[PDB]
C-alpha cells in the first residue's frame, strides 16, 4: 500500500465532536486546541473500510455561513432586492475564522466524514464544510468515494457506532431547501422592511421607523396574536341560564344535578323551565350506568408537544426550551429534540431505557414496580421518518444538569415512563333523574388503576365521592331547584402553546422553525409575554398587522407562507425545482411589493394617528 489515509470528521459543535470521538476511539482520544480557540482537534488511530487509518475529528460552530446581499444605511432601492441585488454567503462569525480552520486541519486528508446534526439545516452545513475542505484535501485517492455522511439521532454509543457502520451521503436537495428559504426570507424580508424604515424615517415624532419590519413568516405569526386581540376587543358577552336541582339521597346526601339541556339563552323559556320544576318535590331515577373507561397514556413526545408543555408547565419560551433541549442532546441526555415523530422505532430498547431510570429517587420505586409488573407497549404514533421521539438516553440528576436542563429532562423522562406505563383505568358512573318534564344527571369518576398518572400526577383523575347505588324507579326528594343566570366570557390572549398549535395547524414554521419565529416577534417587541405565557400584541404590532391587512390580507394570512413552505419541502424531497421555486415566489412578492408601495397610505394613515 501507500501512505496511511487520514480521515477528517466534522461535527456541528465542539462538545459534539469531542463526545463522538471519545465514543469511537473508545477513550484512546488525543485532543489539542485549534487555531481559532473555539474548535479542538481529536486524533486517534482506528479502522475505516477494513483498513488502518488515522482519524481526525473536529467541528465547526453551527452554521459556517449566513446569506447576505453582496455589499446598511446606504441608499439602495428596496425594489431591487428581489432580483437585481446579488446575494452571497458570508462567514456567520468571522472572528472564528471557520473556513481557514477547516482548510488548515482538512489539508492533506483523504476522506471526510460529516457528523453534523441530522436535519435539513445540518445537511446545508455539510456543503458549507465540503466547500471549505474539498479544495484542500489530498489528491491521491481523489477519484474514490471521499465524502461520507453519518446519520444519528443521539450522542450515544449505540447510535454513534451504528452510524459509522452504515455511512451515507449528504442530501443536496435538503441543503438547497434551506438555501431557498434563506434567500426568500432575506430578499422579501429586507425589501418590505427597508422600504418602510426609510419611508417613515423621522416622519412622525413618536415613531422610531427602525422598529417597523415585515417577514414572510413572522408577520403571519404576529397576525395570529393580533387576530385574538381583535376577537377580545369586539367580544360581546351573552346572558344565559342554567337550571340546576339538588336531591337528597337515602344516606342523606345532597346530589347536585346537571341540566340535560345544559343551558339556555332565552329569558322567557328559562323562566318557563324554572316554573315547571321548582314546585316538583320528587325526582325519579330513570337510568343508571357504570362504564369502565381509560384515560390514555400520552403519545411519545415530539418537538411540538415538548414546546407546548415547556411553555405551559415549565414557563419556558419556545427558544429557551429548544436551546435547553439542544444542550441536553449535546451532552447525550436526550435524543435529537427536533422531530415530528411520535412513534418509537421497533429496534429501540424501551425496557433498557426504563431500566436506566430505576435509581432516581423521584421514580425509582415506580420504575422498579413497572419492571416487575412488565412494561406496557407504547401507543402506536406517527413515524415522520426523521428521528425517534424525544427520549431520555441516559440517567441524570439535578446536580449534573442544573435548573433549566433538569426541569426539562424531568418532564421528558416522566413523559417517557408514562408512554411505557399502563393507561389510567377509571369508572364512569351516571344517574338520570326526572324532575317534572325535565331531565337531570349526576356524574362521577372512580379510579381503578392509576397507571401512567403515577409518574405524571398532573394528569390524574380528581377524587370525587362515588355516586350512590340506586335503581330505575327509585325516587329522591328534591331539596332545591334554582336557576343560575350567567354571562359568557371573552377569550384570553394567545398562549405560546396555542400559537404553536396554530402555526402547526396552518402549516407555517415547519421544520422546527416555529420557536425562531415566535421568539422573533417577541424580540421585536410586537408582543409582550404576559402571565401564563400569553402573547399580548403591543401597540406597534397591532398597527402593523392592521396596516398590512388593509393593503393586502395575504400578507397577514398564513395561506401564502404555508404554500411556500410546502414548495420548499418539495425541493428537499427532489420533487420541485430549486431555481423555479425561487423565481416564482420572488415574482409573486415583487408584485405585492409594488402594490404595497402604491397603497402605502393604508399603513401611513394608521401610523400617523397612532404616532402623531
Ligand atoms: Mg443545527
Residue numbers in the entry: -2 to 68, 72 to 612
Copied sentences from the primary study:
Topoisomerase III (TOP3) is a member of the type IA topoisomerase family, which functions mainly in relaxing the supercoiled DNA and in resolving recombination intermediates during meiosis and DNA repair. TOP3β is an atypical topoisomerase that can recognize both DNA and RNA as the substrates12132223242526. Eukaryotic TOP3α and β are unique in that they interact with their specific auxiliary factors, RMI1 and TDRD3, respectively, and coexist with them in the cell. We determined the crystal structures of human TOP3β TOPO domain, TDRD3 DUF1767 and OB domains (DUF–OB) and their complex at 3.44 Å, 1.62 Å and 3.6 Å resolutions, respectively.
The TOPO domain of TOP3β exhibits a toroidal-shaped structure, which is characteristic of the type IA topoisomerase. The TOPO domain is further divided into four subdomains (domains I–IV). The cavity formed by domains I, III and IV constitutes a Mg2+-bound catalytic pocket, where the catalytic residues are spatially arranged in a manner similar to those of other type IA topoisomerases. Previously reported E. coli TOP3 structures showed a transition from a closed conformation to an open conformation in the type IA enzyme upon binding of the substrate DNA39. Our substrate-free TOP3β structures adopted the closed conformation. Domain II of TOP3β appears more flexible than domains I, III and IV in the present TOP3β structures (one from the complex and two from the apo TOP3β in the asymmetric unit), indicative of its intrinsic flexibility for the induced fit binding to TDRD3. The R472Q mutation of TOP3β, which is located in domain II, has been found in schizophrenia patients. The R472Q mutation may hardly affect the tertiary structure of TOP3β, as the side chain of Arg472 is exposed to the solvent and partly disordered. However, the substrate-binding cavity of TOP3β is similar to that of TOP3α. We could find no TOP3α- or TOP3β-specific structural element that could determine their substrate preferences.
